[PDB]
Ligand binder design. Sequence first.
Ligand SMILES: Cc1ccc2c(=O)c3cccc(CC(=O)O)c3oc2c1C
Ligand SMILES: Cc1ccc2c(=O)c3cccc(CC(=O)O)c3oc2c1C
Lengths: 182, 182
Amino acid sequence: SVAHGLAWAYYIGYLRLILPELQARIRTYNQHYNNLLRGAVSQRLYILLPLDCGVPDNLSMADPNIRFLDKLPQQTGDRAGIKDRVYSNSIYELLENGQRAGTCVLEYATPLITLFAMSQYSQAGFSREDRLEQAKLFCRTLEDILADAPESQNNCRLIAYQEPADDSSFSLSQEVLRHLRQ
Amino acid sequence: SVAHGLAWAYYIGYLRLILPELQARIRTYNQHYNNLLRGAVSQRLYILLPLDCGVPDNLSMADPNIRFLDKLPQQTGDRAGIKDRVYSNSIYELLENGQRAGTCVLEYATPLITLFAMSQYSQAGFSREDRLEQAKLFCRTLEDILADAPESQNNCRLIAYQEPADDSSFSLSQEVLRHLRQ
Ligand SMILES: Cc1ccc2c(=O)c3cccc(CC(=O)O)c3oc2c1C
Ligand SMILES: Cc1ccc2c(=O)c3cccc(CC(=O)O)c3oc2c1C
């Protein structure tokens, strides 16, 4: 199953590399730049999983109530496949009624980019119906991996959502805040 | 299947992003740094695909005849999923009979790390046998993707090989040299 393999890949090649040092990076950020931020960023990593697999090039553009505010201090890879590689993470502002309502580290789950591209490419042999099914199966698989993984205990949060195609009322901002507020 | 999704993820999440600008970066390096080099590093990215899925932490240690030379001046991602990740690429010299026989930018295919880890974890439900099967499938699928891909025409070489299991009449540098020699 492609989702099975992608979920494992996203854990083995990203999450288990980034999550162990995340809180420290955040705790650190909250010290050096507390006077600049005048706030605290939350300590979990929030992973957006849109099941329609639409991943915009700039999160800061997908909802106008989500603005980029800063990057986290960098981490350098000292491990197979990422030796001397530089990872950063972005911090975002969440707006409600034009005002900051929360601050968090936010990103889209990259394998969704792959699911979407496989549905667009002939050579992948992968239909739109294949895509939504595999996206749900990806999210369930990743949940199971995380629920029992040494690195992902209490520092990661999966935000899965399906855009009702009927209206444009849906708010990514509100969705994130729903999870945020606890 | 796992390998099929992984080859696509690897193309979509890495190769399509690093290949287009690779050839410019190597020509830049060839021209700017000709005094040091007294040679030309070759123009393609060479991708080690050990079928046993053994990826070391340190490439340079794998073979006494593969030696670190330099880093390629970097490239910062400017697309969906990769704003400001900094990729590091290394140039290596290949020795034959104690003498420099070639110079190329070399790395291991990261999804092999995932196939290996999947065969270690019981939750992934993946046997050692599945692993070899998927490794071959991964290489063949990646081949077919690259053959048709516009952004990866004449700038990429897959080096797939099988180490004799325990005895070690294997030279990684000979494997790389054999491909490089065209
Ligand atoms: C831009 C992009 C697109 C797709 C993937 C991906 O499918 C994928 C699947 C498994 C693991 C990774 C690694 C990562 O997210 O850094 C992946 O990265 C991708 C990236 C970085
Ligand atoms: C350390 C490590 C391990 C496994 C993968 C991976 O399976 C994988 C699968 C698809 C795409 C990527 C992205 C990349 O190679 O940068 C992947 O990256 C991995 C990395 C970076």
